[PDB]
Paper text:
Thus, a founding member of the vanilloid subfamily of TRP channels, TRPV1, represents one of the most sought-after pain therapy targets. Here we report the cryo-electron microscopy structures of human TRPV1 in the apo state and in complex with the TRPV1-specific nanomolar-affinity analgesic antagonist SB-366791. It includes a transmembrane domain (TMD) with the central ion channel pore and an intracellular skirt that is mostly built of ankyrin repeat domains (ARDs) connected by the three-stranded β-sheets and C-terminal hooks. The TMD is composed of six transmembrane helices S1–S6 and a re-entrant pore loop (P-loop) between S5 and S6.
We purified full-length hTRPV1 in lipid nanodiscs using soybean mix and synthetic lipids (POPC:POPE:POPG, 3:1:1) and subjected these two protein samples to cryo-EM. The corresponding 3D reconstructions showed C4 symmetry and yielded nearly identical structures, with a slightly better resolution for the sample purified in synthetic lipids (2.58 Å) compared to the soybean lipid mix (2.90 Å). Despite the map for the soybean lipid mix had lower resolution, it represented a more complete reconstruction of hTRPV1. Thus, we built a molecular model of hTRPV1 in soybean lipids that included residues 115−769 and excluded N-terminal residues 1–114 and C-terminal residues 770–839, which were not resolved in the cryo-EM map. In addition, while both structures had residues 602–626 unresolved, the structure in synthetic lipids was also missing density for residues 713–720 and the corresponding region was not included into the model. The apo-state structure of hTRPV1 shows multiple well-resolved densities of annular lipids in the TMD. An exception is the vanilloid binding site where a bulky head density justified its best fit with phosphatidylinositol (PI), consistent with the previously solved apo-state structures of rat and squirrel TRPV115,17,19,32–34. Accordingly, the head of PI is accommodated by polar and charged residues of the linker domain (H411), the S2-S3 loop (D509 and S512), the S4-S5 linker (R557 and E570) and the TRP helix (Q701), while the PI tails face hydrophobic residues of S3 and S4 from one subunit, and S5 and S6 from the neighboring subunit. Measurements of the pore radius suggest that the pore has approximately the same size in all three hTRPV1 structures and the constriction formed by the I680 side chains hydrophobically seals the pore and prevents ion conductance.
Author numbering:
A (entry chain D): 550 to 601, 627 to 687
B (entry chain C): 275 to 601, 627 to 769
C (entry chain B): 688 to 769
Amino acid sequence: TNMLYYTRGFQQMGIYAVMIEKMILRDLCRFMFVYIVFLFGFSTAVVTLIEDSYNSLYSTCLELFKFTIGMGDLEFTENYDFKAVFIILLLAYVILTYILLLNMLIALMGETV
Amino acid sequence: TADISARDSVGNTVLHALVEVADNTADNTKFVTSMYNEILMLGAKLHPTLKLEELTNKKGMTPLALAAGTGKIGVLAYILQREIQEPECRHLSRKFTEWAYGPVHSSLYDLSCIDTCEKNSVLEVIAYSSSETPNRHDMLLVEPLNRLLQDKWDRFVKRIFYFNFLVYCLYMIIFTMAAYYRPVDGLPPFKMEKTGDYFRVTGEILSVLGGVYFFFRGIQYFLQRRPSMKTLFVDSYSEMLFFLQSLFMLATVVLYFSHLKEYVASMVFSLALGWTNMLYYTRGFQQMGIYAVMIEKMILRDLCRFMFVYIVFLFGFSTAVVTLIEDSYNSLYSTCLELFKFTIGMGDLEFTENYDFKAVFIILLLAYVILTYILLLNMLIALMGETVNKIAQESKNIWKLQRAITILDTEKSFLKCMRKAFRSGKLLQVGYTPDGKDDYRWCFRVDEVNWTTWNTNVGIINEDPGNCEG
Amino acid sequence: NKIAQESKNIWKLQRAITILDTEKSFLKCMRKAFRSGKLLQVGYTPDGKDDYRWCFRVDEVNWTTWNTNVGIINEDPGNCEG
Ligand SMILES: CCCCCCCCCCCCCCCCCC(=O)OC[C@H](COP(=O)(O)O[C@@H]1[C@H](O)[C@H](O)[C@@H](O)[C@H](O)[C@H]1O)OC(=O)CCCCCCCCCCCCCCCCC
Ligand SMILES: CCCCCCCC/C=C/CCCCCCCC(=O)O[C@@H](COC(=O)CCCCCCCCCCCCCCC)COP(=O)([O-])OCC[N+](C)(C)C
Ligand SMILES: CCCCCCCC/C=C/CCCCCCCC(=O)O[C@@H](COC(=O)CCCCCCCCCCCCCCC)COP(=O)([O-])OCC[N+](C)(C)C
Ligand SMILES: CCCCCCCC/C=C\CCCCCCCC(=O)O[C@@H](COC(=O)CCCCCCCCCCCCCCC)COP(=O)([O-])OCC[N+](C)(C)C
Ligand SMILES: CCCCCCCC/C=C\CCCCCCCC(=O)O[C@@H](COC(=O)CCCCCCCCCCCCCCC)COP(=O)([O-])OCC[N+](C)(C)C
Ligand SMILES: CCCCCCCC/C=C\CCCCCCCC(=O)O[C@@H](COC(=O)CCCCCCCCCCCCCCC)COP(=O)([O-])OCC[N+](C)(C)C
Ligand SMILES: CCCCCCCC/C=C\CCCCCCCC(=O)O[C@@H](COC(=O)CCCCCCCCCCCCCCC)COP(=O)([O-])OCC[N+](C)(C)C
Ligand SMILES: CCCCCCCC/C=C\CCCCCCCC(=O)O[C@@H](COC(=O)CCCCCCCCCCCCCCC)COP(=O)([O-])OCC[N+](C)(C)C
Ligand SMILES: CCCCCCCC/C=C\CCCCCCCC(=O)O[C@@H](COC(=O)CCCCCCCCCCCCCCC)COP(=O)([O-])OCC[N+](C)(C)C
Ligand SMILES: CCCCCCCC/C=C\CCCCCCCC(=O)O[C@@H](COC(=O)CCCCCCCCCCCCCCC)COP(=O)([O-])OCC[N+](C)(C)C
Ligand SMILES: CCCCCCCC/C=C\CCCCCCCC(=O)O[C@@H](COC(=O)CCCCCCCCCCCCCCC)COP(=O)([O-])OCC[N+](C)(C)C
Ligand SMILES: CCCCCCCC/C=C\CCCCCCCC(=O)O[C@@H](COC(=O)CCCCCCCCCCCCCCC)COP(=O)([O-])OCC[N+](C)(C)C
Ligand code: NA
Ligand code: NA
């Protein structure tokens, strides 16, 4: 990752790596903070609902982080007790994170660039 | 002769009428702002001992607070930056000059009814404005208001806000950690058998005391700040979500002692809101606050248009697919659910071999895929990108208003805890009344420097006997 | 970025085509197209008769044409159609 220092001897790669640092400090920094509010916000909301194994805060923050990377199973646990709660609570996470906030990130990168 | 106090059936004097007539155009603003001076000169020339701007109408609104409320920003800019440079019309000057050494000069704006008048202060009348007041978000760029709220913030509210944040951070930790460790075995209410269960009910007590808290604090927002049916569900997207959090959080108390497991359905919606409602407290932070303004606009401009159209297609093709399935994915849930997976990148194009015509099925999904994943989610990114270009400074001006509403509720809350609102300005003499007395106006300093007004026409300069308040 | 106002102008035309098919459809259900304007006198013909043109009002305000060159103004005998 520190090879990206030595882009600074190259105008088009160096500027690119300047456009990396600004995003990590402007856009990811604002993003990932808000993202972890929702993530831990719905994660706790889901493992609170689970009873029993996905009754952990890791294995539910881990499974809800998969919706980010396009690997979210909307049925990763049948060990709930109210489905409408669970489904309302994930699709809320999905809409607010995958559709809204990752695509909002692309928008802010676009305005940053 | 004509009585300059032009009280009418509605009570609007001439200055009121000149606020009501404005349009926030350049030709009209250039006009009406001038006219106040000559009306004010004449009011001070032909009928002294009656400063004309304190007068009100039937509804009880000064022309200052009538410009604050009716959305008149260029009018309001004049009345706040009013700088009359001539004797016997100078007490009406609103922006004084406490000194000027070289280019530097300390402007001395008055905080007459920007904050803490007996009714309708400019910050209230802007902050506590309804929804469709034009220019509402730009009306705090007007000096001294931009630098007055940043003064109250850095000096009073930044320390109480970051405390209220912390108390809400721990309220969530206490409520989260009291819900994670809930009793799975049995039907409520539950017992404090183990030692940890005493700490757990404690976090449940402390959880409900905050649910009734944000409940009452969401009631009295509708008793202090009386909204209309349009401004319930618009312009107040926070006082509802913290109040809504309490509805779930108190239904959680109903359904715990009503002997049901449905308390989980409500207790869990209080957590998702509760952490999602941490994004309120970004409004004490410029870059995070604007970001959260760029969240609300998307949810209301872009998701709102998007998700509606998306659910037309989704239910449009879902019904089209389960119509084709025969038999298990012969449900409208398990087909809307499977077709929603193409959105999140988890679409199996072969999630059912229990069809009867494959070309129908495949034409019908790839139509859904192209029109939703490739077109409409990427179209969403495009519209966000055009939104972000639009709402760049229009979100910073919503932010300073979010912070402004916070600065004023903080004043009203701590009206007896520590002090009043602190008055955010030094009582200072600016000159002399036309009746021959001191003035002593609550004024807010603004050190300003200008490298082109080299002459420095003295005019007002008050402590020119001094040099810099020493 | 290109099609921002070029799509609002396609929109008003989509709505326009809807407004006119709606007229043609309900030509006998309720009424004709409603004629969307008040038959009003605007002056006098050059042959010396009334005009009575189906006209559409547009309240307009301008804060720079202070002189108000009278010119046409028709119900200046009145003031605001009272
Ligand atoms: C049985 C129940 C069924 C439900 C229906 C019942 C009614 C629903 C509730 C009504 C509301 C519905 C909201 C829908 C989503 C949109 C939310 C949103 O735009 O909010 C922005 C808000 C801004 O502040 P404010 O309002 O103070 O500022 C306003 C505002 O800027 C204004 O433009 C300016 O004039 C001025 O600045 C000021 O006047 O920010 C916050 O309030 C903090 C952040 C809040 C979170 C933002 C993210 C959105 C989360 C939504 C989902 C909730 C979480 C998941 C729950 C799972 C299911 C339970
Ligand atoms: C870039 C830096 C890295 C970021 C990573 C981000 C990733 C997400 C966050 C990561 C950091 C925080 C994770 C939680 C702390 C560990 C405890 C836990 O998981 O579970 C605790 C339970 O109780 C709870 O889960 C609720 C209590 C939360 C209290 C801590 C506040 C965290 C604040 C930040 C939160 C976000 C708020 C927004 C932040 C701005 C106990 O531990 P356990 O072992 O899980 O329980 C098993 C107990 N049992 C066996 C008896 C049943
Ligand atoms: C943000 C808010 C949430 C949004 C959620 C969005 C998610 C999508 C939409 C969600 C809401 C609507 C879902 C359908 C209503 C339930 C009935 C059903 O599913 O199946 C019914 C069948 O018949 C049909 O499925 C077709 C009949 C549809 C009539 C309802 C119109 C819905 C309008 C809105 C539609 C979108 C139009 C565009 C909207 C602008 C009967 O119920 P069942 O149990 O399924 O059938 C089993 C019967 N059996 C056992 C005898 C075989
Ligand atoms: C010379 C390096 C020898 C390295 C040998 C090692 C292998 C080769 C390694 C890397 C490739 C480097 C090739 C350099 C020559 C290409 C032409 C050029 O000058 O630049 C051009 C292409 O620019 C590039 O190709 C720059 C890419 C390197 C960026 C470094 C980050 C990660 C390195 C990870 C490396 C993994 C290493 C693991 C495997 C060994 C662009 O033109 P410019 O220069 O922008 O224009 C003038 C700039 N000026 C204004 C400053 C004047
Ligand atoms: C965005 C602003 C923030 C809003 C925050 C608050 C939002 C919260 C919303 C709603 C709160 C209540 C929802 C949960 C109900 C409690 C559980 C319950 O009793 O379930 C019952 C089932 O009931 C159903 O299966 C039907 C569910 C109807 C609601 C679906 C849409 C709600 C989301 C609209 C979103 C629009 C948002 C606004 C935008 C337009 C019975 O229990 P069960 O065990 O589930 O029964 C079997 C279930 N099974 C057959 C499925 C297996
Ligand atoms: C800004 C804030 C963000 C938004 C926050 C709020 C978001 C709230 C989100 C979602 C709220 C809406 C879904 C509720 C959850 C399901 C609960 C339920 O009743 O399940 C039953 C559905 O029974 C049906 O009849 C469903 C018919 C409609 C399609 C299902 C939704 C598709 C999910 C994708 C929607 C994507 C679009 C998203 C738009 C929302 C299941 O019953 P069952 O026991 O399995 O019985 C099987 C057979 N049966 C189905 C025939 C009965
Ligand atoms: C968190 C980090 C972030 C920073 C913030 C720090 C936040 C505060 C931090 C910690 C406060 C809590 C410490 C006491 C409990 C520890 C012992 C215990 O019971 O352990 C158990 C977990 O815990 C529980 O089961 C108790 C439930 C959670 C307590 C919620 C806070 C209570 C309010 C008062 C708080 C102070 C407020 C008022 C102050 C004036 C161990 O689990 P177990 O036994 O394996 O299984 C669960 C038990 N069961 C199976 C029987 C169901
Ligand atoms: C309970 C007995 C005390 C023990 C509790 C132990 C603490 C555990 C915590 C939380 C548990 C306490 C009960 C929960 C209350 C609900 C949350 C709440 O009120 O938030 C309010 C805080 O604003 C206040 O004025 C809070 C009241 C004072 C709390 C005193 C305890 C803090 C101790 C710890 C201090 C540590 C300091 C360390 C410094 C480094 C929210 O502010 P608001 O102005 O309403 O604005 C939002 C509402 N709006 C969006 C609608 C506008
Ligand atoms: C707003 C102005 C002020 C409001 C008033 C001031 C106070 C407000 C605060 C608190 C007072 C309580 C208000 C809510 C009602 C309590 C729950 C209840 O009655 O449950 C009933 C059932 O319930 C269920 O069957 C489902 C319960 C879970 C629903 C989850 C969503 C909670 C919504 C939260 C509300 C969000 C609403 C959003 C508002 C837009 C219990 O009654 P029952 O007859 O025994 O039914 C048993 C049925 N069963 C056996 C099949 C299970
Ligand atoms: C003080 C708060 C204490 C909270 C303690 C709790 C832990 C810490 C919590 C949160 C981190 C807060 C650190 C604040 C100090 C950083 C430097 C700074 O001032 O701002 C900088 C960084 O800005 C941020 O770091 C703001 C991030 C908080 C946004 C709140 C939303 C979600 C919170 C979820 C929290 C999960 C909680 C669960 C775990 C406890 C940016 O500068 P600025 O300020 O924009 O510039 C001037 C602004 N002005 C114009 C207004 C003057
Ligand atoms: C965009 C504007 C909206 C248009 C809306 C209307 C579009 C509708 C389009 C077409 C309508 C007809 C298609 C379905 C045929 C009926 C079923 C049938 O008889 O299938 C036959 C099979 O036939 C095939 O397997 C070959 C299918 C040929 C068509 C493929 C391209 C059509 C999409 C072009 C899209 C371009 C769109 C325009 C852009 C350029 C026989 O039955 P079977 O049981 O299936 O036989 C075994 C099948 N198996 C071997 C596969 C297993
Ligand atoms: C604006 C509105 C949105 C657009 C709406 C319209 C969109 C309409 C979309 C798609 C229309 C085109 C596909 C039709 C569906 C297949 C039906 C069929 O005949 O299946 C047979 C295909 O037999 C072949 O020989 C297929 C050869 C071409 C590649 C198949 C398509 C690839 C899917 C990806 C295309 C991605 C690109 C998408 C571009 C369209 C299967 O026969 P079998 O029984 O399994 O036999 C096995 C062995 N055999 C295959 C050798 C025979
Ligand atoms: Na993906
Ligand atoms: Na994927």
